[PDB]
Amino acid sequence: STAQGILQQINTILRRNNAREIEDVHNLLALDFATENQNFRYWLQTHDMFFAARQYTFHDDRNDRHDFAITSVGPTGRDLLSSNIDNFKQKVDSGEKDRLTAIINVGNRHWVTLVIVHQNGNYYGYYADSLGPDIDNNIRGALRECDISDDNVHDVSVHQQTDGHNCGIWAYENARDINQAIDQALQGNSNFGEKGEGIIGYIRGLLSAGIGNDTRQPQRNEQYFRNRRRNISQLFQSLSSPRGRLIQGRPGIQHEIDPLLLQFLELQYP
């Protein structure tokens, strides 16, 4: 069986059940289904990233001073992220927000993190890509259309992964740590300096924790990311994934589609 063979079989079942056919089998995959079958190389999609946000306490709660957005780049390639940064800058002017955390899909299944803080009239930004130091043009173009100065946006990336499949979780690990570094800098642990650059070394200390030669716990090895995947998957228990919407719309169809999805997972992500 091939991926297209599986897709044709799924689409026959969807047709019999008066549901919309799909164009890619990934449309019906989600982190919980993959993790329940021990496919830990599954790349997290946009719908999975909403559940991961709740695991890292981002969806809300960290009404409060922090803004949060899951967006993408690549209408113009920049409109969604630009719109989020604009809405944030308005809320800063309204006195409602101090900080924005954005988790950004840069197109080819790659997730990166951008955190912007406002402190007494200035906007400082910190960008992290788990692949290591390189910033993406659409990100830079979104920042330029929102008048965030390039001098005040800093690439704090550290080499953390090469496999690619865990960049979705690394994006949240890095957002947590950038936000902790900013929090501690506000309390005097470090100084921002004129352009916000002063905290970059402290950020990189947290981003490098538990990888390579660093012995700090948790060691963020493959087993660590398997357990994070298991923990994120527990939050799925429905309507927020395309799979969950199909199941709720056609209860019991999972008995016909899940065997084929498992075959696809074995092929795409062995």
Author numbering: 837 to 898, 903 to 914, 922 to 981, 984 to 1086, 1089 to 1121
Sentences from the study reporting this entry:
Cytoplasmic incompatibility (CI) results when Wolbachia bacteria-infected male insects mate with uninfected females, leading to embryonic lethality. CI is caused by linked pairs of Wolbachia genes called CI factors (CifA and CifB). Protein-binding experiments and expression of cif genes in yeast have shown that CifA binds its cognate CifB specifically and rescues CifB-induced yeast growth defects. CidBwMel consists of a region, which is predicted to contain two PD-(D/E)XK (pseudo) nuclease domains (residue 1-751; hereafter CidBwMelND1-ND2, ND: nuclease domain) and a C-terminal deubiquitylase (DUB) domain.
We determined the crystal structure of the CidBwMel DUB domain to 1.85 Å resolution. Similar to the structures of other proteases in the CE clan/Ulp1-like protease family, the DUB core consists of a five-stranded β sheet flanked by α helices on both sides. His957, Asp976, and Cys1016 form the catalytic triad. An active DUB domain is required for inducing a CI-like phenotype in transgenic D. melanogaster for cid operons. The crystal structure of CidBwMelDUB provides a solid structural basis for further investigation of the molecular targets and function of CidB deubiquitylase family proteins. Given that bacteria do not possess a ubiquitin-conjugation system, the presence of a DUB domain in CidB strongly suggests that this Wolbachia protein functions within the host.
